[PDB]
Amino acid sequence: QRTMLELLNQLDGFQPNTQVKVIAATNRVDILDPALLRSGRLDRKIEFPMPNEEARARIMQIH
Amino acid sequence: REELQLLQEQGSYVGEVVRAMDKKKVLVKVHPEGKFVVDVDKNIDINDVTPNCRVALRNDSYTLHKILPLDKQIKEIKEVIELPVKHPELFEALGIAQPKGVLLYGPPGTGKTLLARAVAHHTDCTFIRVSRMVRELFVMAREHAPSIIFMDEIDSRLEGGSGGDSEVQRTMLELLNQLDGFEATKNIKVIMATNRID
Amino acid sequence: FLEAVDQNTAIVGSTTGSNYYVRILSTIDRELLKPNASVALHKHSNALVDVLP
Amino acid sequence: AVDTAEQVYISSLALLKMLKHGRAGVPMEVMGLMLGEFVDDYTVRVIDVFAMPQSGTGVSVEAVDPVFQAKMLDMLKQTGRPEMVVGWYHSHPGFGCWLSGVDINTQQSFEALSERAVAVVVDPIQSVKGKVVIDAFRLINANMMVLGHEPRQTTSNLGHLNKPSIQALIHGLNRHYYSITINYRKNELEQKMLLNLHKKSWMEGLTLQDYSEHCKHNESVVKEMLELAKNYNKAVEEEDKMTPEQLAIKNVGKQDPKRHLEEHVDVLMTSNIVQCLAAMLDTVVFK
Amino acid sequence: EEKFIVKATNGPRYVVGCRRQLDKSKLKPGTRVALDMTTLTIMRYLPREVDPLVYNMSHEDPGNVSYSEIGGLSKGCLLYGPPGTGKTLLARAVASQLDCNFLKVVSSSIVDKYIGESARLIREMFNYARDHQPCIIFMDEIDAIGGRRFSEGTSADREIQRTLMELLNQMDGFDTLHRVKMIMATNR
Amino acid sequence: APPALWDLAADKQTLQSEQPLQVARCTKIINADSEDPKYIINVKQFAKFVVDLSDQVAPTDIEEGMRVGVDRNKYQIHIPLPPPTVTMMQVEEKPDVTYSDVGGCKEQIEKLREVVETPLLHPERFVNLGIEPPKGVLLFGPPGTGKTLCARAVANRTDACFIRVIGSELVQKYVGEGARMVRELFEMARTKKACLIFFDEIDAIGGGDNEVQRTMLELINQLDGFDPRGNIKVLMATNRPDTLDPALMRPGRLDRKIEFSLPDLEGRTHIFKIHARSMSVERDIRFELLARLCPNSTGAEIRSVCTEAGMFAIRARRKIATEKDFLEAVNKVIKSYAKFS
Amino acid sequence: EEERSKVDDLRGTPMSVGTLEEIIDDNHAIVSTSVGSEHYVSILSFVDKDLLEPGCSVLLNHKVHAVIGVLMDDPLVTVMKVEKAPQETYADIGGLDNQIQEIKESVELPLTHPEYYEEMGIKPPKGVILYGPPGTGKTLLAKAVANQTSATFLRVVGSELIQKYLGDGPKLVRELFRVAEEHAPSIVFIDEIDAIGTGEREIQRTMLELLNQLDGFDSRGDVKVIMATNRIETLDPALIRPGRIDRKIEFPLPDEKTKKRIFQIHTSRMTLADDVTLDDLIMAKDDLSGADIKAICTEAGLMALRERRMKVTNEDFKKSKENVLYKKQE
Ligand SMILES: [Zn+2]
């Protein structure tokens, strides 16, 4: 939380952060940090559920 | 001003020789990043420089300069301390077998320091006290032999502690081997002190 | 200053720890020959002028 | 195969130019060029000495710009300086005045034209301000190792050449690397102009200004120096009261390195300023 | 008074003189100075500083219109977290306007991985607030250190709640805060 | 002095040859390279230096962290030089156990044999018939008669026995040598025309430990990284599955986890068949008899049967070994040692 | 003569003592110092370059560091092993004839009487590892002395040589491995194995490295290593399987009969009186080795020799036995 909240302080207190993005991925949303909501922070929350047998046949067919 | 060039020499180092070599090239242990083996100057011989000693070495030429380093108690003690006062020479003609030392056992209230330093103060001689660190004072007692030596600090089954104590027992046994062994210097008289099982 | 081996000549320990052998100047008397004293040589001549209290 | 006894004439021009060049003698390597005229075999005279711009490479043959050297030399030729180059000088701070391999290589390359090729290394960084003793260097032939090293006549001046007697550099690197003697020269114009210029540099403008300053400071400021002077005098007399006891006991040998006499003589010399300036105040008051 | 002893960083000590330009004002002892390799003259002094002091005295956020870009909004302030944000744009809007300093207090600076003696930092930083006459304190994301200690807390919670006890003892204890101001920002 | 005579006479040209080769800046090693002109170098005295490359050394011959000769006057790199002792100490080219010691695993010996013997013999069959030859297998679990199948794989190559690497050599003083170790043994793996490398004892480098995390995570970066090769061989041998990082990073390239616990009745007579070239066994001795007269007798345990029984056969002062003379050593070394264990 | 006295400029005033690291086949070696200065210069005269054994202290200069000479090191190696052949054979001690024929048959079969060793085709060049409950070199040197009859021997006693100096590492083990390499027909004897029993973190890695180099991963059958400790529990279980691979045996308790045989051997050459009884001598002792009974045989032969007699009376041997009774109780 010191290092993590330090990173969030570098994504909240830095207006020149218009440079290179920081893409993140979490394997579970059980422990969801409430402080991860901001324009610079993880605002784009697109849910990626488990692919069905159709989608698995698609990615397995193209793979 | 001729020495001012030796001031411009930025001084000189302090060499310490640890081992001499037979090839006239003596290695000298110096400050770290040193250990400079070199032949000494021609005006100084090599054999005189003994190893395991510090010397004077220049910082550029590496040349060696020189080697570097109670009325009844006084009535009974007159024959012991007041006898060598006035006639130090008679200790070669007199054959009456003068005693080597004397002991005084009991509660050391008065007589351990005031008597020895008072009658020895009448003798006007030096008063050496004992006060492993028990052999260097014996070497000093060997150097300055004529004095009045008195045990003050030591007066307080076999084992290693009795061997270490037996080193001092050996010191007094060789005090009986020197004193009772052979007289080499007039006025050698000492006083013992013991109050316990010893 | 570390030790005085003889008259008009002694050894002096530098700040870096290395001991230096430098002949003292004749003008300085024997009062500055204290074994535990704050001696100060020159940066080039390496000669002592006066000690610091 | 012939050799003579050469001696480098050094005037105050090259000396003062090597003193300003020594003030500009930064740890970074510097370059310089000496000029003069060759009149005979065993004498060499330097007159013109200038400095060269520094470079990141330092002392090297590549740093010597031939169009800049020949350009400045030509600008000296159009002026009243009809002298050819006689050698090159530089500074070696810290590591000693000796010459490295690069310096002896550019010396070997620069000695193809001039057979003498005088080389001087100034190093005022670690040299005390008491002495400005400078030495000139020379290059020996590599083919002379079979015969004698230096067949130089007039071995008298070698006693004056033995003043740089460092026990590491001169004979620590004397093989294939020797030196030469140095003398000076001064005419009457430099003697009277520089002598009167230095005396005036220690004198006043009208020479009467700062006299009355001390003549009247004897009553205001020197009085404190006279009272303190008497404090040192009494501060020694308190021990001189104890001296006749030791002098009345032993009378054999001297153990105190203090003389107690010449210091008081100097105190009397400082005290005689009042007497010497009293007549000055008598002259200022009179006329 | 003219010539004193200097102590170099490398370890060897020297003695220098006085330059004709400077005076005896900065020449007093206890002030770090600078020297020269030639003649050991003194050009100027060297003011001391620290590592975190550069961070506390270097960050500056520009922008003066942000004070008027907060919208129609006409010893402590609570900025809580209803369904509306922009508290960072407002605190950083006045903070970007003047703020008289940039004394930002992050909620991740009271971690104290070792033994929980953070009282040295509460009294140290609040002692800096009491030392400097002007001071503005921001406390963003206090919900992480705002545990309600309802049940029996462990050693990690007891030290944070103990820092909250120091906050009690320095807010309603035996110390007033009439001049200093704190801004408690949170989310829930 | 006689050796110094001809060299003393050959010391004349050393003065004219003393001017070159004099350059020595304590052989400072570089760290990285931002651009081709400027190279960041760090000397052993903890002083980072930067100098441009000389004209005598090509830029393609510069390696990351390479000790090379460098001038101390011009600071340039005049000439490089090829040069821990454990790396060259770990080189192994020796014949050993052949295929005859199959430990009863009928299917497993094919699961590993089709990846250790077949891909080298048929390179085109696996590229045309499929997309690439298989990666490898994973022998772990109980030790038992371990390291026997490793020597089997070493000897069962029809070209040349390859190098094996144990894992107990990386946990030593002066950490960081492991990086250069694996990078230079993988560089030599590039030099050995796509040779196969075996890595034993992963438990000695897996499972503070961040200085080990450098060597093992960099090891994963060198295994999953196909720069040396991504097709030759993957195989790890461990006693415990308590190494979670190689277990979670292994599904990327490693595959085919198998087991090898103990042989069968018909196997021990084949380990005796490979012991037919051991200490002289008389023709009267039946391998099936001695094999069937000892249960739970894995190849290592019966290797100790031939070791201790060999010792008692030496102590017997006999020309040849007879089963009636060392069977007491057999049942003593398996039963007297099987009592407490 | 002049060519011999012309290189004096290099070995003159600018001369230093450095530490060479290794020799490169490119005629330029690498040296080191307190700060680790690496200079490579073409070799010169007066050097051997073969017996130099890189990794020791050599001679350097204030110049480009051309190697002008070398200096021999470690006179400390002299006290490591003995080079003499003692008359004590395997037939001078009794009771443990099987226990001594196990090691005699174990390490005397390689390189000697090879028809039972090379015809089999095993070659386990590791040797046995023993341990003596009395220790103190008496029993372990009485078992190792069987190999000392007619053969070269290598002796190592105590782990002090590793712990009495800074952590140089396994370089001394490399010295024992190179002297054992150049002295292959020898027997390596490690005595008083108390490395871990007596920094401490480096002792474990130089001991595990001792096991690494002792295993012989690159060398063929060259020498038989015989180790000997005092307590078998001090050694870690990891030092057993790589090291001890041939055989190990146990030594019985020397209470009355083994001390009776030790007393007989220590009193076989000497002459004793008729009244000298044995039950009191084997009764007053309690867990004693042979060094103290040899000490009282020496001071008993000298004390009885004070009267210019070689016969040791009973009262004088009890008067010397008081040293045994006191020494173990002190
Ligand atoms: Zn330079």
For the CA atoms of F234, F240, F246, F249, what is the dihedral angle to 10 degrees?
90
CB contact F19 to D (< 8 Å): yes
Question: Which of B4, B5, B60 is facing D168, going by the closest CB pair?
Answer: B60
Q: Which residue of G has its CA nearest to F28?
A: G38
Closest CA to G188 of G201, G173, G203, G200: G173
d(CA E35, CA E32): 10
DSSP C23: P
In single-letter form, the type of residue at position D85 comes to: V
Partners of residue D147 on adjacent β-strands: none
Other CB atoms within 10 Å distance of the CB of residue D156: 10
Is F145 annotated as contributing to ligand binding? Answer: yes
Question: Burial level of D76, CB count in 10 A (0-12/13-18/19+)?
Answer: middle
Q: Which residues of A9-42 are buried (b: 16+ CB within 10 A; e: fewer)?
A: bebbbeeeeeeeeeeeeeeeeeeeeebeeeebbb
d(CA G257, CA F24): 71
- For the CA atoms of chain B, what is the radius of gyration? 26
Chain D environment of B4 (Cβ under 8 Å): 128, 130-131
Distance from the Cα of residue E78 to its chain's centroid: 21
Residues 6+ away with beta carbon under 8 Å from A53: none
CB contact D126 to C (< 8 Å): yes
- For the CA atoms of chain F, what is the radius of gyration? 27
d(CA B137, CA B128): 9
Name the percent of chain G in helix, strand, coil, to the closest 5: 30, 10, 55
Q: Is residue E97 within 8 Å of residue E67, measured between CB atoms?
A: yes
Q: Is the dihedral of CA E14, E15, E18, E24 positive or negative?
A: positive
Q: Is C24 left (phi over 0), alpha (psi -120 to 50) or beta?
A: beta
Q: Is residue F305 within 8 Å of residue F323, measured between CB atoms?
A: no
Chains that touch E (3 or more CB pairs under 8 A): A, C
Name the percent of chain D in helix, strand, coil, to the closest 5: 40, 15, 45
d(CA G314, CA G275): 6
CB contact G99 to B (< 8 Å): no
Angle subtended at Cα D121 by Cα D118 and Cα D127, rounded to the nearest 5 degrees: 145
Residues 6+ away with beta carbon under 8 Å from D150: D3, D140, D178
D200: tokens are 């005036």
CB contact G33 to B (< 8 Å): yes
Q: Where are the alpha helices (H) located in chain F, listed in sequence order? A: 3-9, 13-16, 85-89, 108-116, 118-121, 123-128, 148-155, 177-191, 210-223, 244-249, 265-274, 287-292, 299-315, 323-331, 337-340
Q: Which residues of B53-72 are buried (b: 16+ CB within 10 A; e: fewer)?
A: ebbbbbbbbbbbbeebeeee
Question: Burial level of E107, CB count in 10 A (0-12/13-18/19+)?
Answer: buried
The interaxial angle of helices F108-116 and F148-155, nearest 10 deg, is 40
Q: Is residue G71 within 8 Å of residue G57, measured between CB atoms?
A: yes
Q: Which residue of D has its CA nearest to C27?
A: D257
Q: Is residue C33 within 8 Å of residue D260, measured between CB atoms?
A: no
Other CB atoms within 10 Å distance of the CB of residue F333: 22
Angle subtended at Cα G94 by Cα G89 and Cα G99, rounded to the nearest 5 degrees: 85
**Residue holding tokens 């503005």?**
E136
B16: tokens are 């310490």
**Residue holding tokens 């046995």?**
G128
Phi/psi at G131 (5° precision): -160, 135
Q: Is B180 left (phi over 0), alpha (psi -120 to 50) or beta?
A: alpha
Q: Is residue F79 within 8 Å of residue F69, measured between CB atoms?
A: yes
Q: Which residue of F has its CA nearest to G171?
A: F85
d(CA E183, CA F180): 53
DSSP G20: E
Q: Is residue B152 within 8 Å of residue B113, measured between CB atoms?
A: yes
Distance from the Cα of residue F134 to its chain's centroid: 21
d(CA E173, CA E166): 9
d(CA B5, CA C45): 9
G146: tokens are 């069987």
d(CA B52, CA D35): 58
Q: Is the dihedral of CA F292, F297, F299, F304 positive or negative?
A: negative
Chains that touch B (3 or more CB pairs under 8 A): C, D, G
Q: Is residue D107 within 8 Å of residue D119, measured between CB atoms?
A: yes
CA–CA distances in Å: residue E61 to residues E103, E129, E146: 12, 21, 28
d(CA D53, CA D59): 11
Q: Which residues of G123-161 are buried (b: 16+ CB within 10 A; e: fewer)?
A: ebbbbbbbbbebbbbbbbbbbbbbbbeeebbbbbbebee
Q: Is the dihedral of CA F259, F262, F264, F266 positive or negative?
A: positive
Partners of residue E184 on adjacent β-strands: E78, E139
Determine the distance separating the centroid of ligand 1 and the alpha carbon of E39, expressed in angstroms.
21
Q: Do G326 and B32 touch (CB under 8 A)?
A: no
Distance from the Cα of residue F269 to its chain's centroid: 29
G316: tokens are 């004088």
Largest CA distance in chain E: 72
d(CA E27, CA E18): 8
Q: Is residue G226 within 8 Å of residue G127, measured between CB atoms?
A: yes
Q: Do G14 and D172 touch (CB under 8 A)?
A: yes
Give the DSSP per-residue string, F277-312: GSS-B-TTS-HHHHHHT-SS--HHHHHHHHHHHHHH
d(CA D164, CA D158): 11
Q: Is residue G221 within 8 Å of residue G110, measured between CB atoms?
A: yes
Closest CA to E92 of E161, E156, E140, E126: E140
Is F207 annotated as contributing to ligand binding? Answer: no
B 52-91 near G (Cβ less than 8 A)? 60-62
Phi/psi at E183 (5° precision): -120, 100
Closest CA to E99 of E15, E8, E183, E7: E183
d(CA D1, CA D144): 10
Q: Where are the alpha helices (H) located in F54-107, listed in sequence order? A: 85-89
d(CA D82, CA D47): 10
Q: Is F233 helix (H, G, I), strand (E, B) or coil?
A: coil
Q: Which residues of G231-253 are buried (b: 16+ CB within 10 A; e: fewer)?
A: eeeebeeebeeebebbbeeebee
d(CA G103, CA F200): 34
Resolution of the solved structure (Å): 5.7
For the CA atoms of D148, D153, D154, D159, what is the dihedral angle to 10 degrees?
-20
Largest CA distance in chain G: 80
E105: tokens are 């207090």
Phi/psi at C6 (5° precision): -155, -170
**Residue holding tokens 């474990």?**
G204
Closest CA to D138 of D121, D118, D122: D118
For the CA atoms of G290, G292, G298, G304, what is the dihedral angle to 10 degrees?
-120
F214: tokens are 């450098």
Q: Is residue E39 within 8 Å of residue E33, measured between CB atoms?
A: no
Angle subtended at Cα E109 by Cα E104 and Cα E110, rounded to the nearest 5 degrees: 125
Q: Where are the alpha helices (H) located in chain G, listed in sequence order? A: 97-107, 138-144, 160-163, 171-181, 200-214, 257-266, 281-284, 290-305, 314-327
**Residue holding tokens 């609570």?**
E78
- Here the contacts of G263-269 (C-beta below 8 Å, separation 24 or greater) are G263/G293, G265/G92, G265/G93, G266/G290, G266/G293, G266/G294, G266/G297, G267/G297
d(CA B39, CA B21): 10
Number of H-type helices and E-type strands within chain G: 9, 9
H/E stretch holding B101 = strand B101-103
d(CA G221, CA B72): 90
Nearest chain C CA: its distance from B64 CA (Å): 11
Phi/psi at G227 (5° precision): -95, 155
d(CA E78, CA G105): 91
**Residue holding tokens 């004793």?**
G272
CB contact B60 to C (< 8 Å): no
Other CB atoms within 10 Å distance of the CB of residue F328: 11
Q: Is F75 left (phi over 0), alpha (psi -120 to 50) or beta?
A: left
CA–CA distances in Å: residue F322 to residues F280, F282, F286, F310, F334: 9, 6, 10, 11, 18
DSSP E45: B
F205: tokens are 């480098």
Q: Which residue of F has its CA nearest to G100?
A: F315
CB contact G47 to B (< 8 Å): no
The interaxial angle of helices E155-171 and E119-131, nearest 10 deg, is 30
Q: Is residue F197 within 8 Å of residue F163, measured between CB atoms?
A: yes
Q: Do C45 and B13 touch (CB under 8 A)?
A: no
Partners of residue D178 on adjacent β-strands: D138
d(CA F334, CA F340): 11
Question: Burial level of G259, CB count in 10 A (0-12/13-18/19+)?
Answer: buried
Chain G environment of B158 (Cβ under 8 Å): 326, 330
Partners of residue E54 on adjacent β-strands: none
d(CA E24, CA E22): 7
d(CA F112, CA F136): 7
d(CA D201, CA D218): 24
d(CA G88, CA G69): 44
Residues 6+ away with beta carbon under 8 Å from F75: F25, F49, F51
Give the DSSP per-residue string, F2-32: -HHHHHHHTTSHHHHTSSSS---S--PEEEE
C48: tokens are 């002592």
Residues 6+ away with beta carbon under 8 Å from D7: D42, D43, D44, D157, D180, D181, D182, D183
Other CB atoms within 10 Å distance of the CB of residue G60: 26
Question: Burial level of D139, CB count in 10 A (0-12/13-18/19+)?
Answer: middle
Question: Which of F27, F45, F279 is facing G122, going by the closest CB pair?
Answer: F279
Between the two ends of chain E, the Cα-to-Cα distance in Å is 64
Phi/psi at E174 (5° precision): -125, 45
F269: tokens are 């007579």
CA–CA distances in Å: residue B143 to residues B138, B183, B185, D165: 9, 15, 11, 48
